[PDB]
Design an enzyme around this catalytic site. Structure first.
Site, PDB file in Angstrom:
ATOM      1  N   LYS A 256      -2.117  14.466 -11.434  1.00  0.00           N
ATOM      2  CA  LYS A 256      -1.397  13.984 -12.605  1.00  0.00           C
ATOM      3  C   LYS A 256      -0.439  15.039 -13.142  1.00  0.00           C
ATOM      4  O   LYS A 256       0.623  14.652 -13.705  1.00  0.00           O
ATOM      5  CB  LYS A 256      -2.367  13.565 -13.722  1.00  0.00           C
ATOM      6  CG  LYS A 256      -3.202  12.330 -13.394  1.00  0.00           C
ATOM      7  CD  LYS A 256      -2.294  11.063 -13.166  1.00  0.00           C
ATOM      8  CE  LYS A 256      -3.251   9.875 -13.114  1.00  0.00           C
ATOM      9  NZ  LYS A 256      -2.481   8.567 -12.855  1.00  0.00           N
TER      10      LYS A 256
ATOM     11  N   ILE B  79      -9.852   3.954 -20.997  1.00  0.00           N
ATOM     12  CA  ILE B  79      -9.973   2.528 -21.097  1.00  0.00           C
ATOM     13  C   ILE B  79     -10.868   2.061 -19.963  1.00  0.00           C
ATOM     14  O   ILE B  79     -10.720   2.474 -18.818  1.00  0.00           O
ATOM     15  CB  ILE B  79      -8.615   1.818 -21.002  1.00  0.00           C
ATOM     16  CG1 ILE B  79      -7.725   2.181 -22.194  1.00  0.00           C
ATOM     17  CG2 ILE B  79      -8.786   0.288 -20.980  1.00  0.00           C
ATOM     18  CD1 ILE B  79      -6.250   1.685 -22.043  1.00  0.00           C
TER      19      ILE B  79
ATOM     20  N   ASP C 100       0.868  -1.158   0.000  1.00  0.00           N
ATOM     21  CA  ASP C 100       0.000   0.000   0.000  1.00  0.00           C
ATOM     22  C   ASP C 100       0.910   1.214   0.000  1.00  0.00           C
ATOM     23  O   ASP C 100       1.658   1.427   0.958  1.00  0.00           O
ATOM     24  CB  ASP C 100      -0.858  -0.025   1.272  1.00  0.00           C
ATOM     25  CG  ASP C 100      -1.746   1.174   1.401  1.00  0.00           C
ATOM     26  OD1 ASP C 100      -1.595   2.172   0.659  1.00  0.00           O
ATOM     27  OD2 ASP C 100      -2.613   1.112   2.325  1.00  0.00           O
TER      28      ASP C 100
ATOM     29  N   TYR D  58     -12.648  15.343 -13.726  1.00  0.00           N
ATOM     30  CA  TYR D  58     -11.331  14.779 -13.313  1.00  0.00           C
ATOM     31  C   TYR D  58     -10.745  15.556 -12.142  1.00  0.00           C
ATOM     32  O   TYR D  58     -10.093  14.976 -11.260  1.00  0.00           O
ATOM     33  CB  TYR D  58     -10.364  14.780 -14.507  1.00  0.00           C
ATOM     34  CG  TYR D  58      -9.221  13.757 -14.422  1.00  0.00           C
ATOM     35  CD1 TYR D  58      -9.494  12.405 -14.301  1.00  0.00           C
ATOM     36  CD2 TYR D  58      -7.913  14.157 -14.530  1.00  0.00           C
ATOM     37  CE1 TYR D  58      -8.449  11.451 -14.252  1.00  0.00           C
ATOM     38  CE2 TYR D  58      -6.866  13.295 -14.476  1.00  0.00           C
ATOM     39  CZ  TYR D  58      -7.132  11.911 -14.336  1.00  0.00           C
ATOM     40  OH  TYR D  58      -6.107  10.975 -14.299  1.00  0.00           O
TER      41      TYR D  58
HETATM   42  N1  LIG Z   1      -8.227   3.538 -17.296  1.00  0.00           N
HETATM   43  C1  LIG Z   1      -8.093   4.717 -17.913  1.00  0.00           C
HETATM   44  O1  LIG Z   1      -8.804   5.311 -18.799  1.00  0.00           O
HETATM   45  C2  LIG Z   1      -6.900   5.484 -17.615  1.00  0.00           C
HETATM   46  C3  LIG Z   1      -6.368   6.533 -18.520  1.00  0.00           C
HETATM   47  C4  LIG Z   1      -5.239   7.102 -18.145  1.00  0.00           C
HETATM   48  C5  LIG Z   1      -4.606   6.844 -17.087  1.00  0.00           C
HETATM   49  N2  LIG Z   1      -4.910   6.002 -16.140  1.00  0.00           N
HETATM   50  C6  LIG Z   1      -4.074   5.674 -14.965  1.00  0.00           C
HETATM   51  O2  LIG Z   1      -3.665   4.340 -15.139  1.00  0.00           O
HETATM   52  C7  LIG Z   1      -3.311   3.865 -13.815  1.00  0.00           C
HETATM   53  C8  LIG Z   1      -3.906   2.443 -13.713  1.00  0.00           C
HETATM   54  O3  LIG Z   1      -5.265   2.560 -13.533  1.00  0.00           O
HETATM   55  P1  LIG Z   1      -6.227   1.517 -14.346  1.00  0.00           P
HETATM   56  O4  LIG Z   1      -7.178   2.318 -15.176  1.00  0.00           O
HETATM   57  O5  LIG Z   1      -5.444   0.478 -14.977  1.00  0.00           O
HETATM   58  O6  LIG Z   1      -7.225   1.055 -13.193  1.00  0.00           O
HETATM   59  P2  LIG Z   1      -7.184  -0.185 -12.168  1.00  0.00           P
HETATM   60  O7  LIG Z   1      -8.369   0.025 -11.352  1.00  0.00           O
HETATM   61  O8  LIG Z   1      -7.041  -1.466 -12.944  1.00  0.00           O
HETATM   62  O9  LIG Z   1      -5.776   0.042 -11.448  1.00  0.00           O
HETATM   63  C9  LIG Z   1      -5.737   1.081 -10.447  1.00  0.00           C
HETATM   64  C10 LIG Z   1      -4.741   0.503  -9.467  1.00  0.00           C
HETATM   65  O10 LIG Z   1      -4.417   1.508  -8.492  1.00  0.00           O
HETATM   66  C11 LIG Z   1      -4.030   0.770  -7.374  1.00  0.00           C
HETATM   67  N3  LIG Z   1      -3.990   1.573  -6.126  1.00  0.00           N
HETATM   68  C12 LIG Z   1      -4.907   2.437  -5.726  1.00  0.00           C
HETATM   69  N4  LIG Z   1      -4.531   2.886  -4.417  1.00  0.00           N
HETATM   70  C13 LIG Z   1      -3.297   2.194  -4.203  1.00  0.00           C
HETATM   71  C14 LIG Z   1      -2.478   2.248  -2.957  1.00  0.00           C
HETATM   72  N5  LIG Z   1      -2.887   3.020  -1.813  1.00  0.00           N
HETATM   73  N6  LIG Z   1      -1.432   1.501  -2.967  1.00  0.00           N
HETATM   74  C15 LIG Z   1      -1.018   0.702  -4.081  1.00  0.00           C
HETATM   75  N7  LIG Z   1      -1.894   0.604  -5.249  1.00  0.00           N
HETATM   76  C16 LIG Z   1      -3.060   1.425  -5.247  1.00  0.00           C
HETATM   77  C17 LIG Z   1      -5.145  -0.240  -7.359  1.00  0.00           C
HETATM   78  O11 LIG Z   1      -4.880  -1.325  -6.447  1.00  0.00           O
HETATM   79  C18 LIG Z   1      -5.246  -0.722  -8.724  1.00  0.00           C
HETATM   80  O12 LIG Z   1      -4.433  -1.790  -9.000  1.00  0.00           O
HETATM   81  C19 LIG Z   1      -3.760   4.890 -12.826  1.00  0.00           C
HETATM   82  O13 LIG Z   1      -2.684   5.730 -12.539  1.00  0.00           O
HETATM   83  C20 LIG Z   1      -4.713   5.714 -13.649  1.00  0.00           C
HETATM   84  O14 LIG Z   1      -4.785   7.014 -13.131  1.00  0.00           O
HETATM   85  C21 LIG Z   1      -6.079   5.225 -16.316  1.00  0.00           C
HETATM   86  C1  LIG Z   2     -13.221  11.844 -14.555  1.00  0.00           C
HETATM   87  C2  LIG Z   2     -12.791  12.137 -15.970  1.00  0.00           C
HETATM   88  C3  LIG Z   2     -12.552  11.018 -16.915  1.00  0.00           C
HETATM   89  C4  LIG Z   2     -11.227  10.252 -16.831  1.00  0.00           C
HETATM   90  C5  LIG Z   2     -11.031   9.194 -17.860  1.00  0.00           C
HETATM   91  C6  LIG Z   2      -9.734   8.483 -17.957  1.00  0.00           C
HETATM   92  C7  LIG Z   2      -9.204   7.928 -16.677  1.00  0.00           C
HETATM   93  C8  LIG Z   2      -9.799   6.803 -16.172  1.00  0.00           C
HETATM   94  C9  LIG Z   2      -9.336   6.246 -15.001  1.00  0.00           C
HETATM   95  C10 LIG Z   2      -8.259   6.831 -14.306  1.00  0.00           C
HETATM   96  O1  LIG Z   2      -7.758   6.292 -13.127  1.00  0.00           O
HETATM   97  C11 LIG Z   2      -8.343   6.677 -11.951  1.00  0.00           C
HETATM   98  C12 LIG Z   2      -7.857   5.990 -10.811  1.00  0.00           C
HETATM   99  C13 LIG Z   2      -8.433   6.284  -9.606  1.00  0.00           C
HETATM  100  C14 LIG Z   2      -9.442   7.207  -9.521  1.00  0.00           C
HETATM  101  N1  LIG Z   2      -9.993   7.486  -8.237  1.00  0.00           N
HETATM  102  O2  LIG Z   2      -9.775   6.623  -7.309  1.00  0.00           O
HETATM  103  O3  LIG Z   2     -10.622   8.536  -8.059  1.00  0.00           O
HETATM  104  C15 LIG Z   2      -9.914   7.901 -10.624  1.00  0.00           C
HETATM  105  C16 LIG Z   2      -9.339   7.602 -11.866  1.00  0.00           C
HETATM  106  C17 LIG Z   2      -7.694   7.987 -14.845  1.00  0.00           C
HETATM  107  O4  LIG Z   2      -6.585   8.483 -14.196  1.00  0.00           O
HETATM  108  C18 LIG Z   2      -8.108   8.530 -16.049  1.00  0.00           C
END
Ligand SMILES: NC(=O)c1ccc[n+]([C@@H]2O[C@H](COP(=O)([O-])OP(=O)(O)OC[C@H]3O[C@@H](n4cnc5c(N)ncnc54)[C@H](O)[C@@H]3O)[C@@H](O)[C@H]2O)c1
Ligand SMILES: CCCCCCc1ccc(Oc2ccc([N+](=O)[O-])cc2)c(O)c1
Ligand SMILES: NC(=O)c1ccc[n+]([C@@H]2O[C@H](COP(=O)([O-])OP(=O)(O)OC[C@H]3O[C@@H](n4cnc5c(N)ncnc54)[C@H](O)[C@@H]3O)[C@@H](O)[C@H]2O)c1
Ligand SMILES: NC(=O)c1ccc[n+]([C@@H]2O[C@H](COP(=O)([O-])OP(=O)(O)OC[C@H]3O[C@@H](n4cnc5c(N)ncnc54)[C@H](O)[C@@H]3O)[C@@H](O)[C@H]2O)c1
Ligand SMILES: NC(=O)c1ccc[n+]([C@@H]2O[C@H](COP(=O)([O-])OP(=O)(O)OC[C@H]3O[C@@H](n4cnc5c(N)ncnc54)[C@H](O)[C@@H]3O)[C@@H](O)[C@H]2O)c1
Ligand SMILES: CCCCCCc1ccc(Oc2ccc([N+](=O)[O-])cc2)c(O)c1
Ligand SMILES: CCCCCCc1ccc(Oc2ccc([N+](=O)[O-])cc2)c(O)c1
Ligand SMILES: CCCCCCc1ccc(Oc2ccc([N+](=O)[O-])cc2)c(O)c1
Lengths: 257, 257, 257, 257
Positions: C162, C191, C63, C155
């Site tokens: 970020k 995604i 964590d 966001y």
């Molecule tokens: N999914 C999207 O559209 C998208 C787009 C751009 C960026 N991101 C970024 O990609 C990254 C991965 O997110 P994802 O979309 O694959 O979602 P996900 O839900 O699969 O992964 C998010 C991860 O964050 C981890 N996490 C949260 N709090 C944590 C803590 N206290 N300690 C250790 N791990 C912790 C979770 O356990 C989880 O594995 C994040 O940084 C997110 O902001 C996501």
């Molecule tokens: C809210 C605006 C739309 C964002 C879309 C792309 C995106 C998706 C998931 C993303 O990942 C997270 C991870 C954690 C949390 N949250 O715990 O609040 C929020 C977002 C993101 O960075 C970015």
């Protein structure tokens, strides 16, 4: 006003909706003395009337496609003014084909050439021709658009030319800056001018910016004019090589989702 | 390799220090089939030898100043290849005057025209001429430099042309992207090539980037080549309209203080 | 493959839709040896199954709110691996209030603190804790989003975090780069992951990017994964301090007008 | 003047070299009514003297680490002013360890927390607390530095916090903009203030900017002040979500080679 004493040459004042009209009105309010250029004999009477509105009879032809007219402009101007403190470049052109529809459909070597010649080259060309008479604290300003930074539909070849224009602001700033001369652009939001009027999708852009910009409103030539006057003034003496957005904040969001 | 099957046309391979040589070597390693362009009869033997090194006899003249040679290039190529998967634009030119010394001293309408025609227009011009034979997953790559983004001494008119080039990457990406075609640039750090060799201050730039970049080292054509091959490949199918820096991180610092 | 021999630790693999799953799959394909972290006892069985899919039994709790768990992670890992070649930071969190609705309505000192602690601080915190065992050619990768650059509705506080994360990429690159270590981010397009699933407006964002991106399609974890594997590899040895967009080109347009 | 009638609250006026002093002096010249904050009982007499210089007896304590003091500030201010037209956030702090030397050496969870709490969170925290009394055409201004954009040696954790601060400008602009409120930053060049005085390498930065900026000179608090007054005024009503450089153009070059 904060431009008292300043002598400023403005290009591009075509009608009272022109961005250059707004800049003229704000510069006159703040105390500057103005001079104007025009293109084409049939506009001499109109620009003479605008000059007179701004207390000036200083009007000169200048088609920036023509080296001789650029040289003749400053030779004429210098018979009136010892020195020049401000230059407003508010000139853009591309062939209609090149800003309609698909980017490649409108692309030809000549369309590219013309768009970059008139919309980008002419700014440092005017700066160079002005330099012998520029005052050490002079300020040069051009107008750009967000299409330089990001691709906007239909802007096409003009977006390439505005990116070259914004780069010229930076290289001009370095060339002219040891002397003390500043060079900046305003990246203006959409405004309904004559140039905008030929763009079929312009109404849609205006609606989109009104709905999605942070200020939820489109900009005016008064707003662009006031920012222009600021940049041309000694208030802005710390500012050069800058592209200032005057667009209700639209550039800084992802809108419409 | 990760370009197996891919057919890629490379411009700009002038010597074995060329950026295009590094890209060629990496694309061949990863399995692509290559073809090459050259400019000027006296280089036919040399480029034929390079093509042969990369297992290819596909060499074609193309001076990108000339519309007829751009059309003839793809007419020739299509007698060999049904389709084209990759295009590497590794072409830049400005008259020597325009990249020496002060920006305005080297500025003329013709120097501006030529620099933008060869260094910027030619990339979307090649793309348009290629389009009838581009595969749906094709990938187009050009080479840019940090002088597009920030003013660097002496780069001058080339910096304007590279800013227009980077904008063309974005407008090309939109034009070609519904088909599935990707368009990107690599903003490469300084590398001692023939083109670099005419720049008096180049040794100083190389020293400065070695001392101040995050990786404290200059980049190689192998590094630029590997990043190029990646962008030309299906590994990069999520990436378009991107300007990727391959410059040891130099763009991201303020160095030398 | 192009990661043969490389030992890579991946955080954030929560389900098979996670971005970290795509990166894991591409790194394994290219020959890397993997290790994984998880948060919370109830996920130990699940992450153990994913590790096994990738030929690994190396799983560790971490964590990133807790300094002791960050130190214990690398103390554990080092009993298996002499050195570490890659680190994937794929971790983001803000309290739900802070990414819903109006930015100020969701703003509190604690929401801000938590979002920046988990989403931004943890990346250089992991880097620092890893440094004693990093190989000289190691590569660290984090995941960011366009909301760092431009304001995107909802966001909110994550966009601030970020932006701090992308700045940490640049300062890490300078700190670690004389050693030879590279540091980069991928700015991924939307995604549908578990994290995305709590965002009411996410369907609308996905539709908007599909309609307006240059490639007229959303990205996949395979595309983000392949770009990730590239950056973690010696193919990318010229690339550091970079934020690479893997978003079908969406960042580079003004869409939806 | 162009701020006639406007009521503006200024934080951060510590000495007569403070950036906030320059902004105060320019706002008073242009006709605004001022109020001031301070931190710590021992500074009450000093800030009272500065307020009096600007024709004001409106001074209030506010340590922005403390929620109660932020609420008490606006409760006090509202007993004098019905409405607030301007807010100047000119507040930055990181523990000394975190802005000296290597980025990772100075990194701890608490140093990160404190730097982001005081230098970034406090700006939207003040905005939120002010909102009930903000006028529809109000204008909020903060101060940032190029270290947000690019990595500068020693700035380290402050660079992360300034990147989050610049993002807050964009999200604030969207939150507050439908009301009509504008939000901007000035990215100021180096100026010898008390805060700058603790930075060992500051003399070297000042020399470097003097030698390499386009205007070949460092900026003053008068220049930053005039740009601040412009942004706080209705002259700038088209401008929001902007980070304006007031740095002699330094941000726009690659210097020192
Ligand atoms: N999914 C999207 O559209 C998208 C787009 C751009 C960026 N991101 C970024 O990609 C990254 C991965 O997110 P994802 O979309 O694959 O979602 P996900 O839900 O699969 O992964 C998010 C991860 O964050 C981890 N996490 C949260 N709090 C944590 C803590 N206290 N300690 C250790 N791990 C912790 C979770 O356990 C989880 O594995 C994040 O940084 C997110 O902001 C996501
Ligand atoms: C809210 C605006 C739309 C964002 C879309 C792309 C995106 C998706 C998931 C993303 O990942 C997270 C991870 C954690 C949390 N949250 O715990 O609040 C929020 C977002 C993101 O960075 C970015
Ligand atoms: N109106 C908008 O939404 C908007 C937004 C951003 C930027 N811009 C830019 O603002 C500038 C001013 O345009 P405007 O919208 O005020 O339109 P306008 O039609 O009022 O002005 C365009 C001007 O360009 C001049 N021009 C064209 N070719 C010229 C040549 N060969 N020689 C000398 N002058 C020539 C015209 O004479 C005219 O005065 C242009 O650079 C334009 O690209 C306009
Ligand atoms: N070498 C560097 O430091 C560096 C850094 C960044 C970017 N770039 C860019 O990389 C590209 C490749 O240059 P390089 O450094 O490998 O140098 P190079 O000298 O090896 O290649 C330059 C090429 O440009 C071609 N060219 C010039 N005019 C042409 C025309 N009219 N028609 C067709 N081809 C023409 C030349 O024939 C030559 O092959 C150029 O775009 C350059 O601007 C070079
Ligand atoms: N001086 C420069 O070169 C320079 C360049 C760019 C930006 N900036 C920024 O300008 C702003 C003003 O700094 P300055 O250089 O004028 O220095 P300064 O020392 O005159 O002002 C710094 C101010 O921060 C205030 N502050 C610190 N902690 C605070 C807290 N807990 N609560 C309320 N106020 C607190 C101080 O009381 C002081 O008034 C800062 O944000 C700084 O980061 C300074
Ligand atoms: C086409 C996309 C929408 C652009 C909206 C904003 C804008 C409006 C007018 C603008 O000015 C011009 C000037 C000349 C020409 N033209 O002759 O082709 C075109 C545009 C503009 O730059 C920018
Ligand atoms: C002049 C500033 C230093 C630039 C260093 C990096 C660089 C090197 C070579 C580069 O390539 C060229 C190609 C052609 C010409 N020219 O013909 O004028 C000039 C440059 C370049 O773009 C970029
Ligand atoms: C360290 C790199 C050089 C920075 C130069 C410009 C600058 C000067 C002063 C600046 O202001 C501060 C305020 C507080 C603290 N601190 O408490 O750690 C540090 C800086 C600055 O932001 C920015």
């Amino acid at each position: 006003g904060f431009l008292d004493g300043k002598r400023i040459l403005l290009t591009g004042l075509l009608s009272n909706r022109s961005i250059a009209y707004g800049i003229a009105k704000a510069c006159k309010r703040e105390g500057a003395e103005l001079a104007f250029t025009y293109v084409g004999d049939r506009f001499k009477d109109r620009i003479t009337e605008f000059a007179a509105e701004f207390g000036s009879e200083l009007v000169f032809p200048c088609d920036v496609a023509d080296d001789a007219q650029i040289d003749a402009l400053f030779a004429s101007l210098k018979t009136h003014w010892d020195s020049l403190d401000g230059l407003v470049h508010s000139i853009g052109f591309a062939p209609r084909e090149a800003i309609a529809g698909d980017f490649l459909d409108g692309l030809t070597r000549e369309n590219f050439r013309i768009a970059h010649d008139i919309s980008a080259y002419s700014f440092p060309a005017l700066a160079k021709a002005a330099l012998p008479m520029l005052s050490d604290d002079a300020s040069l300003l051009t107008l750009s658009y967000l299409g330089a930074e990001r691709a906007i539909p239909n802007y096409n070849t003009m977006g390439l030319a505005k990116a070259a224009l914004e780069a010229s602001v930076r290289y001009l700033a370095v060339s002219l800056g040891a002397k003390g001369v500043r060079v900046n652009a305003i990246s203006a939001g959409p405004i309904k001018t004559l140039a905008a009027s030929g763009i079929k999708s312009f109404g849609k852009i205006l609606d989109f910016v009104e709905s999605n910009s942070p200020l939820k409103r489109n900009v005016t030539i008064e707003q662009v004019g006031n920012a222009g006057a600021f940049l041309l003034s000694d208030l802005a003496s710390g500012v050069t090589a800058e592209v200032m957005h005057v667009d209700s904040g639209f550039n800084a969001v992802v809108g419409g989702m």
